[PDB]
Design an enzyme around this catalytic site. Structure first.
Site, short mmCIF file in Angstrom:
data_model
loop_
_atom_site.label_atom_id
_atom_site.label_comp_id
_atom_site.label_asym_id
_atom_site.label_seq_id
_atom_site.Cartn_x
_atom_site.Cartn_y
_atom_site.Cartn_z
N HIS A 1 13.55 6.48 75.38
CA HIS A 1 12.60 7.07 74.89
C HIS A 1 11.01 6.77 75.26
CE1 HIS A 1 11.06 9.33 71.40
NE2 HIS A 1 10.42 8.44 70.80
N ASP B 1 10.59 -6.29 73.25
CA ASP B 1 10.91 -7.47 72.81
C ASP B 1 12.12 -8.00 73.55
OD1 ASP B 1 9.28 -7.91 70.43
OD2 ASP B 1 10.29 -6.23 69.56
N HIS C 1 6.03 27.43 59.13
CA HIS C 1 4.76 27.28 58.24
C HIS C 1 5.09 26.35 56.97
CE1 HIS C 1 6.96 30.39 55.79
NE2 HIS C 1 7.25 31.18 56.66
C1 LIG Z 1 9.31 32.30 50.37
C2 LIG Z 1 10.03 32.49 51.55
O1 LIG Z 1 11.49 32.44 51.73
N1 LIG Z 1 9.59 33.16 52.61
C3 LIG Z 1 9.98 33.65 53.62
C4 LIG Z 1 9.44 35.14 53.94
O2 LIG Z 1 8.11 35.13 53.94
P1 LIG Z 1 7.33 36.29 53.07
O3 LIG Z 1 5.78 36.04 53.15
O4 LIG Z 1 7.98 37.70 53.71
O5 LIG Z 1 8.12 36.30 51.55
P2 LIG Z 1 7.16 35.73 50.35
O6 LIG Z 1 6.68 34.39 50.28
O7 LIG Z 1 8.38 36.13 49.32
O8 LIG Z 1 6.03 36.82 50.14
C5 LIG Z 1 6.21 38.26 50.33
C6 LIG Z 1 4.86 38.89 49.98
O9 LIG Z 1 4.97 40.20 50.38
C7 LIG Z 1 4.55 40.94 49.02
N2 LIG Z 1 4.87 41.97 48.75
C8 LIG Z 1 6.45 42.32 48.55
C9 LIG Z 1 6.91 43.44 48.17
C10 LIG Z 1 6.01 44.55 48.14
O10 LIG Z 1 6.59 45.63 47.50
N3 LIG Z 1 4.63 44.34 48.28
C11 LIG Z 1 4.09 43.11 48.65
O11 LIG Z 1 2.96 43.02 48.95
C12 LIG Z 1 4.38 39.89 47.96
O12 LIG Z 1 3.51 39.96 46.87
C13 LIG Z 1 4.11 38.49 48.62
O13 LIG Z 1 3.01 38.09 48.76
O14 LIG Z 1 9.84 35.72 55.45
C14 LIG Z 1 9.62 34.97 56.39
C15 LIG Z 1 10.10 35.69 57.63
C16 LIG Z 1 9.97 33.55 56.32
N4 LIG Z 1 9.76 32.74 57.48
C17 LIG Z 1 9.64 32.94 55.02
O15 LIG Z 1 10.12 31.48 54.96
C1 LIG Z 2 20.52 4.73 74.40
C2 LIG Z 2 20.02 5.82 73.48
O1 LIG Z 2 20.93 6.33 72.69
N1 LIG Z 2 18.90 6.35 73.46
C3 LIG Z 2 18.17 7.00 72.48
C4 LIG Z 2 17.04 6.30 71.87
O2 LIG Z 2 16.31 5.92 72.73
P1 LIG Z 2 15.41 4.51 72.67
O3 LIG Z 2 14.72 4.23 74.04
O4 LIG Z 2 14.71 4.50 71.33
O5 LIG Z 2 16.86 3.73 72.53
P2 LIG Z 2 17.40 2.32 73.13
O6 LIG Z 2 17.82 2.85 74.65
O7 LIG Z 2 18.23 1.75 72.34
O8 LIG Z 2 16.20 1.57 73.53
C5 LIG Z 2 15.58 0.73 72.71
C6 LIG Z 2 14.23 -0.06 73.17
O9 LIG Z 2 13.64 -0.71 72.12
C7 LIG Z 2 13.45 -1.95 72.32
N2 LIG Z 2 13.52 -2.59 71.02
C8 LIG Z 2 14.30 -2.34 70.10
C9 LIG Z 2 14.24 -3.26 68.96
C10 LIG Z 2 13.01 -4.08 68.63
O10 LIG Z 2 13.04 -4.80 67.71
N3 LIG Z 2 12.17 -4.19 69.76
C11 LIG Z 2 12.20 -3.72 71.04
O11 LIG Z 2 11.60 -3.60 71.74
C12 LIG Z 2 14.83 -2.36 73.17
O12 LIG Z 2 14.65 -3.50 73.68
C13 LIG Z 2 15.10 -1.27 73.82
O13 LIG Z 2 14.38 -1.52 75.31
O14 LIG Z 2 16.30 7.25 71.16
C14 LIG Z 2 15.82 8.41 71.63
C15 LIG Z 2 14.89 9.30 70.65
C16 LIG Z 2 16.88 9.19 72.43
N4 LIG Z 2 16.40 10.38 72.88
C17 LIG Z 2 17.88 8.41 73.17
O15 LIG Z 2 18.89 9.07 73.55
#
Ligand SMILES: CC(=O)N[C@H]1[C@@H](OP(=O)(O)OP(=O)(O)OC[C@H]2O[C@@H](n3ccc(=O)[nH]c3=O)[C@H](O)[C@@H]2O)O[C@H](C)[C@@H](N)[C@@H]1O
Ligand SMILES: CC(=O)N[C@H]1[C@@H](OP(=O)(O)OP(=O)(O)OC[C@H]2O[C@@H](n3ccc(=O)[nH]c3=O)[C@H](O)[C@@H]2O)O[C@H](C)[C@@H](N)[C@@H]1O
Ligand SMILES: CC(=O)N[C@H]1[C@@H](OP(=O)(O)OP(=O)(O)OC[C@H]2O[C@@H](n3ccc(=O)[nH]c3=O)[C@H](O)[C@@H]2O)O[C@H](C)[C@@H](N)[C@@H]1O
Lengths: 194, 194, 194
Positions: free
Chosen positions: A14, A35, A124
């Site tokens: 990491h 450490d 969002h």
């Molecule tokens: C809450 C949720 O799940 N939202 C998802 C949804 O977002 P929307 O903004 O499409 O959904 P909404 O939160 O139900 O809002 C729809 C909007 O369209 C409007 N409206 C509606 C009918 C109409 O005939 N006229 C009109 O104007 C209605 O009043 C509302 O403000 O689709 C996205 C692709 C996703 N990323 C998002 O997570």
């Molecule tokens: C081997 C593995 O799975 N690594 C994963 C791990 O990486 P780290 O580098 O966090 O894990 P590590 O290889 O166990 O190393 C932790 C380091 O923190 C140190 N340390 C620890 C405790 C402390 O109290 N003080 C201190 O200093 C410890 O000595 C070591 O060098 O998390 C990432 C998000 C992943 N991408 C990565 O694959």
């Protein structure tokens, strides 16, 4: 304003990627602290920018608290390729990692100590709770709430409007389709030999 | 050529992201229209560029038709980070949303009213039927045909050369491995508590 | 230094995307070669840069060997949008395809004849064995070893620290959660009609 040098706490895998992001941001030198190998943290170190490069959420938090209490600034490391909506909120100087090609859309909120790993997507209006880890390719649909300290595994996803309880794990490849009010480990189906 | 202002029809979550894309394209002002809050559409509005920011495929289509019949131009909103092959075809002025980090490869065809949501991928030679929605992280392999009005959920995917019938749903996280000649709802296995 | 022209061996769908990448890199002309249509390879052709645009790992390898033995240079085709860590190692002039928005993190190693397809991710410290294919959206977590000639399907993923045996297939959408010492075909659960 950013210091020329940065302390990176965690000198394994990491730490390697956090260093690349720090270099992408313009840091000139990364100094590893750990450490269990190499140079140690001491309360007495000069005040460079800090980052906690430890993947484990519980340990990253503990170390984050120690560093904060010693008066150091824990910066965000944000790759330049990350696309962040102007209405998204990313907690300032809060040890947040944002990896390459992450997208954060309108009104999403990112709390302190979060990892948004490579190519993850925060849609969002999401809320991503402190010290959570959204792994590589993991994606939260619109208006998802991720609780504090959660781990979302590689290529996992959460359907729109769902809430995941604090301290939960969503396994690699898994699809969360319902709200989870109680913490747990929610897993998908592993690949099986034909 | 693009107007300075754009009407965005749909003032909820989808409208928020359409507005970010419109601003990324250089629009100076987005004016929200909605049947159920704020300012309403009227046949009599000045001819600014329009976009239908409604996720639901059936409703987006109905509203699209009303706007077209009133003589307004429904533009495509295409994020600058989208990578579109020079031999790909994206229907012009056809209310297509292309979100950040979408990739559309060689000879793929995108029909009117389509949503290509954040970081989706449309591989070479795909055909994406009108008023379909390819959600966040959803991916079509080479030479896939997606029927009209289909919905592909977050992180779903379609294997190469497959065809999905008009008016079908592919669930979040689901993997389509065979042709579907008849419409349906095709779902994967949800995360399960250990 | 790169020639103005490039021979692309394989004149179907994969050739189409390799051509887009070659054009993105600055090649001025792509000349298709194919055993079963259009112009053929001949040992006697002028020494332009070569690329083997065949998806099948076994065939790409066979053709790669023939081209090498005839003294031609088989270049890497790497899209400009690919993000490659400065400590990552990509075998030089080794017929590697790196598609748009691929990320390769710290210390990852990419061997010859590999395909890293659209938006795939190779995390820190991975080893990707020669003539493997990581398909569209497929992702390897930290410190993963992919054996020689492996195929990882669309949207598949491998959990951290795992090893996949030479000549294995990981199906589209599948999640590898354990080491596989013996080759096999490891599949996920296909979408099912409700
Ligand atoms: C809450 C949720 O799940 N939202 C998802 C949804 O977002 P929307 O903004 O499409 O959904 P909404 O939160 O139900 O809002 C729809 C909007 O369209 C409007 N409206 C509606 C009918 C109409 O005939 N006229 C009109 O104007 C209605 O009043 C509302 O403000 O689709 C996205 C692709 C996703 N990323 C998002 O997570
Ligand atoms: C081997 C593995 O799975 N690594 C994963 C791990 O990486 P780290 O580098 O966090 O894990 P590590 O290889 O166990 O190393 C932790 C380091 O923190 C140190 N340390 C620890 C405790 C402390 O109290 N003080 C201190 O200093 C410890 O000595 C070591 O060098 O998390 C990432 C998000 C992943 N991408 C990565 O694959
Ligand atoms: C149809 C299909 O599934 N295509 C997939 C395939 O694309 P290809 O272009 O590799 O596959 P093809 O459509 O079977 O074409 C192979 C080409 O290689 C040629 N050829 C073959 C043998 C030979 O010994 N000499 C020779 O030249 C053969 O004549 C043909 O033109 O792999 C990609 C990675 C995928 N994206 C794509 O979806």
């Amino acid at each position: 304003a950013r210091t020329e040098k940065i302390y990176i706490y965690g000198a394994s895998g990491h730490g390697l990627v956090c260093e690349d992001v720090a270099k992408n941001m313009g840091y000139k030198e990364c100094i590893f602290l750990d450490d269990f190998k190499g140079m140690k943290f001491e309360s007495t170190l000069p005040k460079y920018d800090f980052f906690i490069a430890i993947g484990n959420n519980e340990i990253r938090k503990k170390i984050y608290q120690k560093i904060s209490e010693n008066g150091f600034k824990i910066v965000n490391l944000i790759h330049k390729s990350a696309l962040i909506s102007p209405s998204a909120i990313v907690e300032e100087n809060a040890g947040i990692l944002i990896m390459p090609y992450v997208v954060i859309n309108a009104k999403a909120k990112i709390e302190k100590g979060v990892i948004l790993n490579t190519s993850s997507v925060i849609e969002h209006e999401c809320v991503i709770g402190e010290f959570s880890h959204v792994s590589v390719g993991a994606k939260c649909a619109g208006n998802v709430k991720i609780g504090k300290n959660c781990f979302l595994g590689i290529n996992s996803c959460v359907l729109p409007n769902l809430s995941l309880a604090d301290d939960s794990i969503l396994g690699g490849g898994a699809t969360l389709v319902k709200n989870q009010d109680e913490k747990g480990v929610f897993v998908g189906v592993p690949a099986k030999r034909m």
